[PDB]
């Protein structure tokens, strides 16, 4: 099983850590807690942190919701519809947010065997102490919708209420409220090299009201995530040399590795949104030991 890398443009690809194709690539700096917990994978295809297979599915929760009288709250359901077993040995449920924001949405249900349907807006703060996903529950502050009745939230955008003040897009949130520390977290990343720095995959996070921080980095693109699960190749090595060819010329555009572990960095210096052929994709050529010095980009 040779190692590959899906052939995929970065916009015919999906961003792991919201629901959202992916728009660009961006490497930079140093002073962040840097530990997103989906789009966590490791290049042989063990999956970590909150980390699941499908895109649709990041940011969503389905289960039940009892609404306190003149918010509401939700009792999780399996991504399944299924019961929620605290117990598994994950941070959360697989999907749920890995950073601190008020996540704007939807709020969808249907009243059982019967026919009738309703929806309604709804926010839910990561940040608020009453997020407890690995709990089990969590409340959304609506716009206003039944108990007993299957209720889904789909995600759709983050907000603010200060500029760029939020999202906080590294901020992990407490999955278990007062409670205790997030359990079985994915390890917290950072170029360790000399002068490399992380090569992230950007998009940007719908805005629904004020002015949000919208960006959105994630280190894999979820196809990679579903492809290492699928071939699930061996790491010869700590260490694999990607190159960014141009199709249609048939030219290398630039290097970078991809470290066994899940990430993606390279030899560059400072902030610069990359600027990449549409058509560009990656392509492996070999691994190599941790020394291997990249040729700039």
């Given at each position: 099983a040779p190692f590959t890398g899906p052939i995929l443009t970065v916009e015919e690809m999906s961003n792991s850590r919201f629901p959202i194709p992916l728009e660009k690539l961006y490497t930079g700096p140093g002073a962040f807690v840097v530990q997103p917990?989906?789009?966590?994978?490791?290049?042989?295809?063990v999956l970590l942190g909150?980390?699941?297979?499908?895109?649709?599915?990041?940011?969503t929760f389905r289960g039940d919701v009892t609404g306190v009288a003149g918010d509401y709250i939700m009792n999780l359901a399996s991504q399944n519809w299924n019961n929620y077993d605290?117990?598994?040995?994950?941070?959360?449920?697989?999907?749920?947010?890995d950073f601190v924001g008020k996540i704007q949405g939807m709020l969808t249900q249907t009243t059982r065997e019967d026919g009738s349907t309703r929806a309604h807006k709804a926010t839910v703060s990561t940040?608020?102490?009453?997020?407890?996903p690995k709990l089990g529950s969590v409340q959304y502050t609506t716009d206003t919708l039944q108990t007993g009745q299957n209720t889904k939230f789909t995600p759709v955008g983050v907000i603010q209420d200060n500029?760029?003040?939020?999202?906080?897009?590294?901020?992990?949130?407490?999955?278990?409220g007062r409670t205790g520390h997030n359990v079985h977290l994915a390890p917290a990343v950072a170029p360790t090299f000399p002068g490399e720095q992380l090569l992230f995959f950007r998009s940007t996070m719908p805005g629904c009201?004020?002015?949000?921080?919208?960006n959105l980095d994630c280190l894999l693109p979820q196809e990679w995530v579903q492809h290492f699960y699928q071939?699930?190749?061996?790491?010869?090595?700590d260490v694999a040399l990607l190159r960014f060819v141009?199709?249609?010329?048939?030219?290398?555009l630039f290097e970078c590795k991809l470290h066994k572990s899940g990430y993606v960095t390279v030899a560059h210096t400072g902030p610069h949104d990359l600027v990449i052929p549409p058509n560009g994709y990656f392509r492996f050529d070999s691994w190599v030991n941790q020394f291997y010095t990249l040729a700039p980009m």
């Open positions: 917990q989906n789009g966590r994978c490791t290049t042989d295809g909150t980390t699941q297979l499908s895109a649709v599915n990041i940011c605290p117990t598994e040995e994950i941070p959360a449920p697989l999907g749920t947010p940040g608020s102490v009453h997020f407890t500029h760029q003040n939020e999202p906080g897009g590294w901020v992990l949130p407490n999955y278990s009201s004020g002015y949000p921080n919208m071939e699930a190749a061996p790491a010869q090595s141009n199709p249609d010329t048939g030219r290398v």
